Design a protein around this ligand. Structure first.
Ligand SMILES: *[C@@H]1O[C@H](CO)[C@@H](O)[C@H](O)[C@H]1NC(C)=O
Lengths: 29, 40
């Protein structure tokens, strides 16, 4: 998940369908 | 469902769809066609 590279170099990562115990960290549905 | 198959969730939950059908229905009852053309 990214804003544009013209806007920031920060990114976030989604592990689709994976529970966080198996992988700042947040458990979405 | 596990041979590399996955099912992804929809962007809008059933509760978000039901808020949209409620808003459409409450607009239709209280304000006629006007909420489609501009302000209710
Ligand atoms: C993730 O796994 C842990 C340990 O099995 C469990 O306590 C937790 O309820 C799970 N959460 C979800 C959203 O699956």
């Amino acid at each position: 998940i990214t804003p544009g590279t013209n806007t920031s170099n920060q990114v976030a990562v989604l592990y689709q369908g994976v529970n966080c115990t198996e992988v700042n960290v947040f458990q979405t549905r | 469902k596990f041979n590399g198959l996955t099912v992804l969730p929809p962007l809008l939950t059933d509760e978000m769809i039901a808020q949209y059908t409620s808003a459409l229905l409450a607009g239709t009852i209280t304000s006629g066609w006007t909420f489609g053309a501009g302000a209710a």
